[PDB]
């Protein structure tokens, strides 16, 4: 399925993922696409910070859902 | 708009507030108050790595675990109005 | 003493028994809720959802959301006896 | 260290364990000593159900603690 990842500046990447994808895998895909080190990525969905070892299905992320990307400064 | 649970970005009701992610919610033995164990955004001398009164309830980095009453917390207002790329209602186009 | 994992009883007629799988405060509610997994299916139970939002996952019709303040440590298990007492524990601390 | 496992009917057994042992490890030890399949075992300590992939240390289970064994015979 396809999800969106949108930074606080509106910069958006589209990712092909499976519900079984771990958050760390999502972070690695983001680094590949935009080059942001995973350690800097805070991924947010439904008011929650996503943790590396969980899956997208653990957070009930849906087709075309938007994850928000906040960078650690 | 999403309430408070484990994983929630939270702010503690202080002037000014500070921020942490809820890592654990529970009422420990001997307390009649529901507590949130928070991982703070920035180190704080004295804070633990996820222990409360000798019991470990999660693991953070040293100096960044803080246990507060859940009622002392609210959703992190810095991120509570982030907007999605697309929305279900938009499908309606008549 | 109620945490995720606690065996809980809900006072009722008959009292429900379950394991706490989730503790939190959903949007709109002024008190903290426990999400319990019951042993058997119940009318009005879900599979982990409360007012449409999923908070955990269990079998169909086994999830019950109840005010934490209305749960108590399961009285049946609270009544089982340890092999070793606190007197023996105190003795161990010294010798 | 030594812990106890007591069935609801009061049959008690001692186990030799380590704080770092997993709950699944403890269930395997009960299977080895008593014959009870691990997937039938529901282990309770201090009012909480013990989950398979956590350690005794995670639950702060001390020497001479008593775990209670409920069987899921269904």
Numbering used by the authors:
A (entry chain C): 1 to 73
B (entry chain D): 467 to 560
C (entry chain B): 469 to 563
D (entry chain A): 1 to 74
What does the paper say about this structure?
A detailed understanding of how CYLD CAP-Gly domains bind Ub came from two crystal structures of the CAP-Gly3 domain bound to Ub determined at 1.7 and 1.9 Å resolution. To obtain crystals, we slightly extended the CAP-Gly domains C-terminally; crystal form 1 (aa 467–552, 1.7 Å) crystallized in the tetragonal space group P41212 and crystal form 2 (aa 467–565, 1.9 Å) crystallized in the orthorhombic space group P212121. Also, the Ub binding mode between the two structures is highly similar, with hydrophobic CAP-Gly3 residues Leu475 and Val487 engaging the Ile44 patch of Ub. In addition, hydrogen bonds are formed between CAP-Gly3 Arg488 and Glu507 with Ub Glu51 and Arg42, respectively. Interestingly, the extended C terminus of CAP-Gly3 (from aa 542–565) adopts two short helices, and Phe545 from helix1 forms further hydrophobic interactions with Ub Ile44. Chemical shift perturbation mapping of CAP-Gly3 bound to 3-fold molar excess of Ub revealed a comparable Ub interface in solution studies as compared to the crystal structures. CAP-Gly3 uses a central Leu residue, Leu475, and an extended C terminus with hydrophobic residues to bind the Ub Ile44 patch. Mutation of Leu475 to either Pro (as in non-Ub binding CAP-Gly1) but also Arg (representative of CAP-Gly2 and most other CAP-Gly domains) abrogated Ub binding without significantly perturbing the structure of the CAP-Gly domain. The chemical shift perturbations within labeled CAP-Gly3 upon NEMO binding mapped to a separate highly conserved surface, revealing that NEMO and Ub interactions are independent of one another.
